[model samples]
Target chain A: EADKMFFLIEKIKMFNQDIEKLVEGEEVVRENETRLYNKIREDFKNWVGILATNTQKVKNIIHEETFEIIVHQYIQQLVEPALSMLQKAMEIIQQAFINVAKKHFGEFFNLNQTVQSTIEDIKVKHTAKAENMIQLQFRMEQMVFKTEIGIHLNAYFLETSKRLANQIPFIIQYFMLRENGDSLQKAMMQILQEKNRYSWL
Target chain B: EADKMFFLIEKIKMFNQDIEKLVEGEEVVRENETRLYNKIREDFKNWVGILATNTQKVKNIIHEEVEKYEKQAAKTFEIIVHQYIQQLVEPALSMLQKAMEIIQQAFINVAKKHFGEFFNLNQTVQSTIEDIKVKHTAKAENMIQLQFRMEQMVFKSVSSFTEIGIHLNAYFLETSKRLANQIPFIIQYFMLRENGDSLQKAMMQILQEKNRYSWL
Candidate 1:
């Protein structure tokens, strides 16, 4: 007969460790970071193309004002795609947690079910929190126009693009993966104290 | 020859008088508060439509998810709402830009009448007028954007997933009312009051310029 407390402790440890590695692993990191960076680059190129084409079509007398409007529109478009990226990240991390739970508790049906439910709850909480942060960032971007001294529009776009490339991935990693795993580990430990559930073990 | 100082002051006075009429919604060329208010009503009506359509969409998405995924469903709904709210910025700014364009041209026409023959001075003051328009437009845009930002951050949940649509609709109704009034006020305050004041001061400052009579 396996020691139930031992199983719980090992499961918690394994889950936490796996989560850390999962987030830091090349597969997850590359998928989240590189893909998002490429998306930003692609969007930036398209915007620049529009800028060049529009400049030829329209007069240059209102060039600065026209540029301002174009940039504002460009920034606004970024928010939805950024949220969608988070959705994908959440899905990947959610599946990873489910796999980890099944790995440790597959032998016991009740235990597996309990852990799976907790995983879902943890994910929901953290994803919501992370998404709020992202939306807030986007809103701030809309209201606040950050700039540099004597900077060209192209340089500004690059800086803005790079900032988002790093920030979105960081938010997703910290909230959806790190805090998510921590919450699940805490929930697992609580089960060790629920004496009534011991018989199911 | 007309005294340069008096001519400048009179032109500035005339411009301010015209601006007041424009802001007070008495402009003969239209593009006043009445038209802007109509735009507010039209946009708000569309928002109600958006709310109903998206609420139905959310309900359908919620129903498709299995029982275990309600929390995820709720989060998805919130994101959708936030996204739609973000989309609102463009339309608000578009309305503002068009209104500002009309008013801007009105100001330019006055400047052209006063300073038209003086090519160098006309161009200088016109450039200043453009600057004022850009500044005031940005201020109004920021305030309008802030309104939507505040709305996007508002997240409400309930014990029952089935009632999410009803709650969202109810919350949006209040927000829609607030925005309808708030956005119009912002545009008027910034574009009319602030822009007019700045343009008046800018014209008056040109009176201080040395060798100003050469341009006249």
Candidate 2:
């Protein structure tokens, strides 16, 4: 159960970081930022709902072995669906920006090269960390339930879960601001071009 | 500071009771019940704002008194407010019912007699209660620099916070329903019969009817 709880927490943390990085990348792609921002917002909302429901269940089953299994199932059912939607949204943003870049800067322009690299970095770092954490979690779960090891593991699991859960709001807010900044910059550039033309006339 | 804190608590308690009773009695006078109900609603809203502001100030002052005052004062204030609100809730309900009864019996002379006696007693009771409430609230304010102290301690979550939230919500909902039902009946009774016809004359006629009916 402890292993499953840790796995769920690690997965949520990884997903949060991935979405945060995705939002940051989307900020550079002016035209498609809104779509990406909304996607992130929706995903965050869904994550909050899932986290709250699972937290309540965890509290109820805190002393029981089945608590971890319940937490795992909640993540699998709710969090996974949200992640899939988020991935789809990110893909849409990527496609839209590619098209925009190709139209304005020629077909040879590499629109997503920087974003792709950053996302790859996140995937590499977080995936390995998650796997290691899960392995340690499994070992701790198999140990004596009343031992210091078990207590320490449970404390870590609780703290990690809370930290990940709390991060959702900040992540969503960051994306929202990024999207707004891109839109404002695009508007200002357009205004400057109009002013330049008027001056020439 | 401690004495002032106690005084503020007492005043708040009295103000709470006065509002509760006024709301209750307003239900019985059928003619202007709606108008009075709205007035009371507005009054309560204003009162809550006042209480919140005063409580905030009291908290700040109390916190500055001593390091120990920080924890003890806040916990005491919170517990006192919760208890005070809870204690007044049932009384507010009973007051509403009594108001309705008075309105319904407005046409009977015996009703008029009973109402007169009731009204005098109520006025006396309310005056004394309000005096005590004001006294306590004053003390509470003096003891605590309510706003500043409260601001410092405001973010810290109290034990059973959720329970307090739930209880307060329930109390508001229940009181609202009772207040809603009784207000209209009292308003119509007071407006059409009491003020339109000379209320005193109306009561005299009601008294005669009560006497005749009971004698027969």
Tens digits of per-residue lDDT for model 1 on A1-201?
544445556756776676555544423333345432344345444544544444333333234444467656665666666776777777766777687678777888888888888888888899898898677555544433424443465555544554555445556666776567667777777877756666676
| lDDT per residue as tens, model 1, B1-216 | 445455666766777676655555554554443443344346545544554565456445545543446667666667666765666677667767766776787778767876787788789889998999999998888867755654553332126655665666555544554454445556666777678778878877877775765665
Which 10-residue window of candidate 2 chain A scores lowest in summed lDDT?
A137-146
lDDT digits (tens) for residues B6-66 of candidate 2: 3324433443343333333433345644434454345445444444444444444434433
lDDT of 2 at B119: 60
Candidate 1 off by > 4 Å:
A1-201, B1-5, B29-74, B156-158
| TM-score, cand. 1 | 0.43
- Listed per model in order, the count of residue pairs whose N, CA or C atoms clash below 3 Å is 0, 52
What are the chain B TM-scores of all models?
0.72, 0.23
lDDT scores in order: 0.63, 0.38
DockQ of 2: 0.01
Best by lDDT: 1
